[PDB]
Amino acid sequence: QRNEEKAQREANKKIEKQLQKDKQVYRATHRLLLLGAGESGKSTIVKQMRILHVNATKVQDIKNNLKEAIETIVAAMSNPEFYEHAKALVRACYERSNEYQLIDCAQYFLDQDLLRCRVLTSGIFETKFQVDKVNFHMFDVGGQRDERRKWIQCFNDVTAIIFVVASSSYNMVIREDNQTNRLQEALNLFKSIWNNRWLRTISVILFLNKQDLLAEKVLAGKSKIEDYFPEFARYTTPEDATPEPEDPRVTRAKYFIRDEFLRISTASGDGRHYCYPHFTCAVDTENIRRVFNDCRDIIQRMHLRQYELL
Amino acid sequence: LDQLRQEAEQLKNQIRDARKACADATLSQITNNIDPVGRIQMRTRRTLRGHLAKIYAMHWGTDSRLLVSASQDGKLIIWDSYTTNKVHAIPLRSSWVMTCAYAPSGNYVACGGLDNICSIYNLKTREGNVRVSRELAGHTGYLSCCRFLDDNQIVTSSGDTTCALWDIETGQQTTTFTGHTGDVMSLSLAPDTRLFVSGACDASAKLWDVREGMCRQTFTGHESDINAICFFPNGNAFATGSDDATCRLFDLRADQELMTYSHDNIICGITSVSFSKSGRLLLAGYDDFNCNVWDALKADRAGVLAGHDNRVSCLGVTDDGMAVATGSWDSFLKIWN
Amino acid sequence: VWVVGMGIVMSLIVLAIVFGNVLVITAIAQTVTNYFITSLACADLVMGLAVVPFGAAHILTTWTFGNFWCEFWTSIDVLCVTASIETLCVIAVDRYFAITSPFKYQSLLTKNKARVIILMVWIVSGLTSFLPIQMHWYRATHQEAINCYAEETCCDFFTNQAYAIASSIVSFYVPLVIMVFVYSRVFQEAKRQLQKIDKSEHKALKTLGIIMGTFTLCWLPFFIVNIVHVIQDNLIRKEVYILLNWIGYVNSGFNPLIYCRSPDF
Amino acid sequence: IAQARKLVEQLKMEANIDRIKVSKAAADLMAYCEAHAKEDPLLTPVPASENPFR
Ligand SMILES: Nc1nc2c(ncn2[C@@H]2O[C@H](COP(=O)(O)OP(=O)(O)OP(=O)(O)O)[C@@H](O)[C@H]2O)c(=O)[nH]1
Numbered sequence: 001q002r003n004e005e006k007a008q009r010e011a012n013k014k015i016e017k018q019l020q021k022d023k024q025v026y027r028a029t030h031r032l033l034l035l036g037a038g039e040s041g042k043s044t045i046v047k048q049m050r051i052l053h054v055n056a057t058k059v060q061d062i063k064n065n066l067k068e069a070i071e072t073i074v075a076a077m078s079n080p081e082f083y084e085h086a087k088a089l090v091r092a093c094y095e096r097s098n099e100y101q102l103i104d105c106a107q108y109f110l111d112q113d114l115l116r117c118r119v120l121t122s123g124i125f126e127t128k129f130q131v132d133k134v135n136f137h138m139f140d141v142g143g144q145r146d147e148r149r150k151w152i153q154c155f156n157d158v159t160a161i162i163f164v165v166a167s168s169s170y171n172m173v174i175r176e177d178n179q180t181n182r183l184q185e186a187l188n189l190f191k192s193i194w195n196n197r198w199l200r201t202i203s204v205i206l207f208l209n210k211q212d213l214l215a216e217k218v219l220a221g222k223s224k225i226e227d228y229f230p231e232f233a234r235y236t237t238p239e240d241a242t243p244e245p246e247d248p249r250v251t252r253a254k255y256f257i258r259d260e261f262l263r264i265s266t267a268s269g270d271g272r273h274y275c276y277p278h279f280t281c282a283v284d285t286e287n288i289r290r291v292f293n294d295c296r297d298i299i300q301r302m303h304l305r306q307y308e309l310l
Numbered sequence: 311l312d313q314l315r316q317e318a319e320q321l322k323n324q325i326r327d328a329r330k331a332c333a334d335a336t337l338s339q340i341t342n343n344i345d346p347v348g349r350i351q352m353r354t355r356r357t358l359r360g361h362l363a364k365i366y367a368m369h370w371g372t373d374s375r376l377l378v379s380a381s382q383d384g385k386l387i388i389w390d391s392y393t394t395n396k397v398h399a400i401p402l403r404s405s406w407v408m409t410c411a412y413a414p415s416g417n418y419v420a421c422g423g424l425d426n427i428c429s430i431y432n433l434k435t436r437e438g439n440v441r442v443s444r445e446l447a448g449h450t451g452y453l454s455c456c457r458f459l460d461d462n463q464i465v466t467s468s469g470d471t472t473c474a475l476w477d478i479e480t481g482q483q484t485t486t487f488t489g490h491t492g493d494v495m496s497l498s499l500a501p502d503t504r505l506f507v508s509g510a511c512d513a514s515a516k517l518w519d520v521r522e523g524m525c526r527q528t529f530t531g532h533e534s535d536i537n538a539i540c541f542f543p544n545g546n547a548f549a550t551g552s553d554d555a556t557c558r559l560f561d562l563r564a565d566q567e568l569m570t571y572s573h574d575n576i577i578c579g580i581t582s583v584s585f586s587k588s589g590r591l592l593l594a595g596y597d598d599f600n601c602n603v604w605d606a607l608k609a610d611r612a613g614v615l616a617g618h619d620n621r622v623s624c625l626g627v628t629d630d631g632m633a634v635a636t637g638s639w640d641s642f643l644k645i646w647n
Numbered sequence: 648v649w650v651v652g653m654g655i656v657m658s659l660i661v662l663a664i665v666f667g668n669v670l671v672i673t674a675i676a677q678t679v680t681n682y683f684i685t686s687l688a689c690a691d692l693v694m695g696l697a698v699v700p701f702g703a704a705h706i707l708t709t710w711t712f713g714n715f716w717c718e719f720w721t722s723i724d725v726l727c728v729t730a731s732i733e734t735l736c737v738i739a740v741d742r743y744f745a746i747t748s749p750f751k752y753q754s755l756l757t758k759n760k761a762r763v764i765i766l767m768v769w770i771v772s773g774l775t776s777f778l779p780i781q782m783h784w785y786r787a788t789h790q791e792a793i794n795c796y797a798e799e800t801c802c803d804f805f806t807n808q809a810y811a812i813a814s815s816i817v818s819f820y821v822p823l824v825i826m827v828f829v830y831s832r833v834f835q836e837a838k839r840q841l842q843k844i845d846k847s848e849h850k851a852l853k854t855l856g857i858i859m860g861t862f863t864l865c866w867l868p869f870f871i872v873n874i875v876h877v878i879q880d881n882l883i884r885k886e887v888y889i890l891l892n893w894i895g896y897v898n899s900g901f902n903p904l905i906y907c908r909s910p911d912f
Numbered sequence: 913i914a915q916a917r918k919l920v921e922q923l924k925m926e927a928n929i930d931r932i933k934v935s936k937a938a939a940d941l942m943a944y945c946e947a948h949a950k951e952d953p954l955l956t957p958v959p960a961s962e963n964p965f966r
């Protein structure tokens with residue numbers, strides 16, 4: 001049938017025609033992978049994009065978080081009517097919360113509301129938006145902790161990697177007790193990500209999250225960094241310091257965590273690796289230009305490096 | 311308590327002693343009189359273009375004329391190998407895909423990936439509009455492979471050290487398999503579709519039973535992860551491709567490893583293995599941008615296919631043994647003959 | 648000895664230019680920005696194959712070919728000279744657009760836009776050379792060109808008409824006033840980035856310097872003396888003019904070797 | 913807990929199976945390959961007149 005070749009040729013034409021339109025859209029997008037430890041703030045940052053950049057079981061979910069937090073505090077003490085019973089409400093147990101596991105959102109719920117709750121999801125969590133007619137594609141792989149991370153070879157073409165750490169969690173253990181404090185656990189994950197075979201040409205944007213809790217912890221005399229980190233005793237404030245408006249004690253604490261992450265980056269970084277440290281609060285900070293301004297630097301630096309200039 | 315662990319060593323020692331008694335003679339000595347195959351050289355016949363990104367999945371059809379490919383740009387294209395003409399291009403709900411399949415009757419195509427869900431599509435339908443038929447969503451962790459026992463049963467191997475035999479009509483797991491301590495990465499059904507294997511990440515492989523749903527044997531000869539597996543055409547042996555440079559051939563009846571394939575210069579990994587029609591040539595992909603051809607009975611390299619500009623991630627042989635298709639990460643397929 | 652050995656020198660330069668341009672063109676024959684490099688290589692190969700062997704015999708000694716053949720050669724010379732120079736400005740503009748505006752670089756330029764630009768620039772280059780030669784409007788009215796125009800075996804070039812100035816203005820003056828600004832902006836942008844690096848924690852000068860200096864040194868003296876000799880009362884000898892023209896021609900031999908430095912282009 | 917108890921019971925099932933010598937398996941594989949090597953287009957090239965892809 002002469003017709004049979006003719007029809008097939010006609011069918012290949014429609015398919016090939018669309019793939020021309022889809023190629024232009026695909027090549028003009030930026031993909032940003034999110035990484036972090038457990039209970040860090042990866043989900044909250046994505047929610048900040050959906051609230052301003054683009055565009056109900058929450059009521060039930062909010063109550064569940066409040067119910068779980070109520071029993072956790074009273075249990076450690078030994079070691080319509082239902083809501084009213086817990087309303088009357090042990091305060092000293094909440095003060096020494098570093099000796100056990102407790103959710104950060106316990107105090108606010110018991111005493112930004114929709115984005116303060118915590119929900120655990122196993123499937124990949126995705127989000128698309130535009131800011132200045134330039135397409136952006138932010139997604140978080142998430143899931144339960146995996147120590148093999150065999151899927152990381154798939155993300156070999158992303159524009160940048162966003163890293164989120166909890167800077168107010170230097171005196172709490174992670175999951176099984178007696179393990180290293182959460183800040184040390186984040187450092188070990190950073191070294192594995194930084195010194196990775198596949199991720200040899202990917203930049204890292206470092207977010208030092210949860211700044212507001214850090215300020216109040218140092219202000220109170222509960223715990224001292226010198227106990228957990230002996231090297232903090234000999235630390236001195238760097239000369240190239242530009243603290244916003246802050247006490248000298250709080251400013252010194254902020255940087256010691258930041259420069260401690262940098263020494264890992266600068267050791268093995270000989271070109272094609274850059275780290276951009278930022279001080280951010282996930283819930284409160286209202287500008288998304290930090291990612292936008294940075295993403296214009298990886299591209300230009302990449303072009304500049306290209307052509308041998310730098 | 312501790313007594314059970316004490317008896318675990320005794321049983322572990324018992325297995326090794328039994329296998330040592332059955333090692334009458336190595337396979338190398340018995341086949342020393344077979345004439346070598348010689349030099350095998352093939353040239354590219356067709357090249358298929360039209361993918362926007364790297365490719366992980368590929369599977370032929372029963373007629374050995376049509377094949378389906380998958381990529382992380384969000385497309386599932388079906389080709390026509392003879393005349394190089396695309397037939398379909400199904401957009402996907404998720405941009406992360408790690409596997410694909412093709413039904414024996416050609417009426418369905420399967421897919422899955424990091425979205426923890428296996429999807430089934432329909433090709434032969436009224437009005438000629440491909441639409442999602444079912445969505446199998448009971449797992450945790452990513453998927454690795456999908457295989458079609460029939461138009462109603464599909465076998466998946468998720469990343470939570472489990473496997474299951476699904477049922478498209480009801481969308482529920484008929485049976486589930488446990489026993490692996492590491493991520494499952496591949497599987498291959500038997501020619502009679504009565505048994506299948508699975509290469510986990512704990513350097514071990516098992517031989518499950520489809521009906522009874524219980525393990526039968528375990529081979530632990532490797533030293534690293536396992537990325538590929540495939541049965542001998544006879545149905546009583548299979549070959550394994552591990553993360554290290556070695557590939558080994560096991561035997562079900564003798565319950566021992568028979569041969570090992572390695573080369574001093576090769577220090578890369580293996581991502582896909584397959585046999586020939588008569589089970590005489592053992593092709594195998596590699597991370598060093600080419601594909602090698604081994605010998606099943608001699609362990610002698612007999613050719614190299616190095617026409618690719620990126621790593622090889624999939625490979626397959628037609629049902630009539632006439633062509634070999636090898637995908638790669640540069641969005642280009644090739645047909646060798 | 649000296650005449651014939653210098654002839655050996657011209658032969659060597661011709662073989663070298665032909666081999667280099669042809670190999671680069673074959674390896675390239677692929678990126679959105681490689682079309683301009685391919686065009687430059689093709690123009691270089693055409694000029695090397697068509698001009699130098701013809702001019703070598705005339706330089707050594709009587710022009711054997713006819714008047715039409717001489718006119719065709721002295722017309723294609725201008726087209727070949729002005730085709731390569733105009734492409735460098737396009738390359739500089741493309742690099743400036745790519746670096747200064749990163750996000751809009753993908754949307755601004757495409758294959759169709761590159762094809763339109765290359766066709767337009769080639770048409771503009773071609774219109775300048777062959778049209779006056781075919782029309783013969785540029786022929787000088789002095790008493791020295793009559794002998795060359797009357798003798799079919801004697802070849803020489805003379806144009807006191809304004810055409811020489813435009814030829815230079817549209818061949819050589821326009822590209823540099825743009826390239827200087829483009830590369831100054833590129834250098835300024837590169838200098839800002841290192842400084843930013845210092846707060847978080849020169850090969851560029853060398854590469855920009857060589858990129859400028861090669862074509863500047865090769866072409867500035869020719870387009871200087873070309874304007875100078877018409878205004879002056881024969882202050883420039885013809886042999887010096889031919890030597891400077893050849894020195895300018897040498898640029899195309901090494902231009903493909905400048906670009907394509909990245910291995911296995 | 914009882915994970916060890918479950919494991920040892922499973923291992924006892926695989927301890928008592930029928931096994932044959934390596935020589936018989938190697939002979940079977942060699943015989944199968946020798947018998948079916950005739951219709952192996954990849955091994956022995958087919959003429960271009962009977963090649964669908966040529
Ligand atoms: N006080 C304070 N809490 C924050 C801030 N950013 C995030 N959080 C905490 O984040 C909680 C919401 O759940 P997250 O901790 O973000 O959980 P998640 O980020 O999904 O956890 P991962 O799965 O590890 O990414 C809030 O209830 C806060 O306790 C911040 O800037 N300040």
Ligand SMILES: CN[C@@H]1CCc2c(ccc(O)c2O)[C@H]1O
Nearest residue numbers: 724725728804811814815818892
């Ligand atoms: C001597 N040969 C020609 C004559 C004049 C001329 C040249 C080059 C570029 C121009 O714009 C010109 O007007 C020379 O290569």
